[PDB]
Structures are given as C-alpha cells and as structure tokens.
Design a protein around this ligand. Structure first.
Ligand code: SF4
Ligand code: SF4
Ligand code: SF4
Ligand code: SF4
Lengths: 92, 73, 73, 92
C-alpha cells in the first residue's frame, strides 16, 4: 500500500508470463530462515511471507539484486527480466 | 554472445562484460568464482523529486544551470 | 548634564554615560584617563545594499522572515 | 569623486557654520607627520593634504572618530556635530 504508491510512479513493462524471481525451495523460507531478510531488505516490497508460502510480487521488482545477495541460503533464482521488460527508468 | 532473442547469437572476437553490479554474466565467464556477499554491496535507494527550477535555485543557493551537491550524514 | 542647547542644563541625581565608543564624555567625568589608542578600536565600514526580498531568499538559502548571517574571512 | 558618490546616499543635516573637525596645529601636519594617517584612514575622504594646508571636508564626516584616534600627534580637535546635525543614518 505505502510503497506501491511510489512504485506506481515508475514505468514498467511487466513480463507476467515469465517471473524472473523464483524461489528455489519454499521449505527453506519456512523453517530454515529466521528473520526473512528478503522481506525486510526489499526496496519494492516484492517479498511478503504469508503462511501460504512466500508471495513474490515480481511485477514491482526494481532489479537491484538485493534479495539474491541478502538471502543467506541462496534459494532465490534471481534473473533480470528479459530485454525491454522490467523497470524502465525515465530520468534515472 | 547468446541473447534472450529467438535467433540471437552474436559472434565476436572479444566480449566486454560491462554489465555493472549483480555479476550474473561475469560468473558465466568463469570470473567471479562466488556471488556477491552482502558486505561488498550497498543498497542505494533514490528518489527524483520534481522541484520547479526556482526552489532548486533557492534551496541550493545557485542560479542558472549551476548546481550544488549535498552529502547527508 | 549640560547640553548644546541654549537653556540646556538637566539636573539629575545620577548620570549614565551610555554614549558608546569615542569616549569624549567619559573623559569629562574623570574616567578614561587617556583617549583611545588605535589598537583598542577597529574601523568598521558597512554598506546596506537594497536586494529585493527574493534574491535574499535565494543567496542565503532561506525563506519568509528567516535570516542567515555570513562571516567573511 | 569615488566615495562622494557613496556619501551622497547618506542623509546629512550639515552644520556649515560650526565645523566639528578642527586641526589644532597645521604645522604638525606639514613637517612633523610623515604618512598622514588621517587621510589614508578616513572612511569618508574628509581629509585631503594639499600644499595649501589640510582640506577638511567636514560635511561628509560619518562621526566614526578614526581621525582623532589614528592621528599620532593629537592635533585634531574632534567633536561630534551638534544635536540634529551630522550623519542621520536611515536604517543604520
Ligand atoms: S531469504 Fe532465502 S530463505 Fe530467508 S526467506 Fe527469503 S528466500 Fe526463504
Ligand atoms: S530485485 Fe531489488 S526489488 Fe526486485 S526483488 Fe530483489 S530486491 Fe526487491
Ligand atoms: S595626523 Fe595629526 S598630524 Fe598627521 S596629518 Fe592628520 S593631523 Fe596633521
Ligand atoms: S570622523 Fe570618521 S569620517 Fe569624520 S573625519 Fe574622522 S574619520 Fe573621517
């Protein structure tokens, strides 16, 4: 709600059929992870840990790369979106 | 270079990996034997705010395509 | 107090010599046994420049009856 | 010429019949004085040493008091102008 007000300002070409943020193992995010640093350090609120699993709202991804690096267990299959997709920064 | 395009295969005598941070393509070339650990990088969050060309002159103490930079601690 | 006025002679039980620098009247009261030497004083030359209320806001980085002071070395 | 452009900006009530800057001895200003610090340190160019003597243009005096103090020999009979005379600083 709060940061998706500011993500509305950015320009995107969303690739909804190709999620570039896949989580390799959902069970590592349930019992192996304690603090979930992918949620607390994502500048775009992409990751939200529900009890249904991890909700990865990849459409707002700013392609920074923090989630892949801050994740201690490596279970974020992180790619850039394809060419002409993802954030399209105007006056970046 | 192979690309995400369908018939995309560019042939070259050399390839310059100038792709910035997130060394995804550097690790494919054999360089960067590990990924970035979260002490080699800094999360930098930036806003571009529309301030209408004369308040920029007033709050920075400048005028007419002369600029000022603030570093905030 | 005697004054430069014609019938000017003000009588008072006490006289406060709050007349600033150039201690002319202080030396008449017996205080200031000598004059000022030119190391006890500083020549201060000041201009009041008319700058029209919005360039003052721009060159000082302020707005709306908030002021800034520069000390120049 | 130069500073009397800026002395024109000030407001004066000149007392021309009562010069408040008298020089006690003109001969001290001719042979006893070397550098004439009354000329070189007057913010209003009141003193000008001609060969006819010292020209004391007391009408532009800013009543600072430098001349009396910077004079090494004490031969400046320095007074303030009378009440309602001299500089009248507006927004001083
Ligand atoms: S960091 Fe790795 S483990 Fe912890 S939650 Fe995000 S993905 Fe699951
Ligand atoms: S890339 Fe930056 S924005 Fe997209 S998910 Fe990982 S952290 Fe959040
Ligand atoms: S300083 Fe005293 S002595 Fe030297 S010129 Fe001025 S008046 Fe004459
Ligand atoms: S008072 Fe100030 S201005 Fe008047 S003469 Fe002496 S120095 Fe020059």
């Amino acid at each position: 709600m709060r940061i998706e007000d500011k993500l509305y300002l950015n320009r995107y070409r969303t690739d909804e059929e190709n999620p570039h943020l896949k989580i390799k193992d959902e069970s590592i995010c349930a019992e192996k992870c304690s603090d979930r640093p992918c949620v607390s350090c994502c500048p775009a609120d992409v990751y939200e840990w529900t009890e249904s699993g991890m909700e990865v709202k990849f459409e707002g991804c700013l392609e920074c790369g923090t989630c892949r690096i801050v994740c201690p267990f490596g279970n974020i299959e992180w790619n850039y979106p394809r060419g002409n997709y993802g954030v399209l920064y105007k006056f970046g | 270079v192979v690309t995400s395009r369908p018939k995309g295969e560019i042939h070259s005598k050399a390839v310059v990996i100038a792709e910035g941070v997130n060394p995804i393509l550097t690790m494919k070339a054999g360089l960067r034997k590990e990924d970035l650990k979260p002490h080699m990088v800094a999360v930098a969050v930036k806003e571009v705010i529309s301030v209408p060309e004369d308040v920029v002159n007033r709050v920075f103490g400048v005028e007419g395509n002369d600029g000022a930079t603030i570093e905030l601690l």
